[PDB]
């Protein structure tokens, strides 16, 4: 099974450094994290306004970290500004959800958001995500045995970022080219890594689909939240994602 070429090790370094530099709290997240109190994010009688309020306050930095991740990839910097915007809108919630899912802790049954806020399945559900909370937690549980490292997480992020089917893109072929560069480097890294999980590469590709489904469904939850919540309750960066 082929291992990375020299050019692919160079890409692996670049992508991994970009992720590590932009992942909240880095290696100290578990020390930093504060458990959101249990009285926040309980089921109403719709949206628990206090949990919602907490989540809206941390969305802007989470999106901003994804922006910063992308800007550290020369391939992404080569794209026209309008393609950069469309790719960012498309992948932000996917990447943040991956970043939360890899911070699932079975001992507390929480994900950690923004490197500091540990939340339960119910809190994230009732704060606005609905079934998407379950999707992300499930994902997190299923990733525990995958033992993904920084590199593997970063490569999953780059694959999501370089998605040539986002609507309105101009550089569709160039963006597929970049994706396939990432995919090949990733498969070759996975081959080198020898995880003790059968059919690991096709299984990872199913996790990418799961993240794409999460991303799509955040839009759905936004529309549902806008029934109870005026748009001005959402931070303007989050509003831009969905316009």
């Amino acid at each position: 099974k082929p291992e990375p070429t020299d050019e692919e090790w160079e890409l692996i370094k670049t992508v991994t450094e970009a992720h590590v530099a932009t992942n909240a709290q880095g290696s100290h997240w578990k020390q930093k994290r504060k458990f959101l109190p249990e009285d926040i994010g309980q089921a109403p009688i719709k949206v628990d306004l206090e949990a919602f309020s907490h989540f809206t306050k941390i969305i802007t930095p989470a999106i901003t970290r994804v922006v910063d991740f992308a800007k550290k990839l020369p391939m992404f910097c080569e794209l026209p500004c309008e393609d950069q915007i469309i790719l960012l809108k498309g992948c932000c919630m996917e990447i943040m959800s991956l970043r939360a899912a890899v911070r699932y802790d079975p001992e507390s049954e929480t994900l950690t958001l923004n490197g500091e806020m540990a939340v339960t399945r119910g809190q994230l559900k009732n704060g606005g995500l609905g079934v998407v909370s379950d999707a992300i937690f499930d994902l997190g549980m299923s990733l525990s045995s995958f033992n993904l490292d920084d590199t593997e997480v970063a490569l999953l992020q780059a694959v999501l970022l370089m998605s040539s089917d986002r609507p309105g893109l101009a550089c569709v072929e160039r963006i597929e080219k970049y994706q396939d560069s990432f995919l090949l480097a990733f498969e070759h890294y996975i081959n080198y890594r020898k995880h003790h999980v059968t059919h690991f590469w096709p299984k990872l590709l199913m996790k990418v689909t799961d993240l794409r489904m999460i991303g799509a469904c955040h839009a759905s939850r936004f529309l549902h939240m806008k029934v109870e919540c005026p748009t001005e309750l959402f931070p303007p960066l989050f509003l831009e994602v969905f316009e």
Binding site: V67, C81, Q84, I85, L88, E240
Partner: peptide, 11 residues
């Protein structure tokens, strides 16, 4: 639109 994203991307 996309004003703020465009700012964050560009600078």
């Amino acid at each position: 639109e996309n004003a703020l994203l465009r700012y964050l991307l560009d600078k």
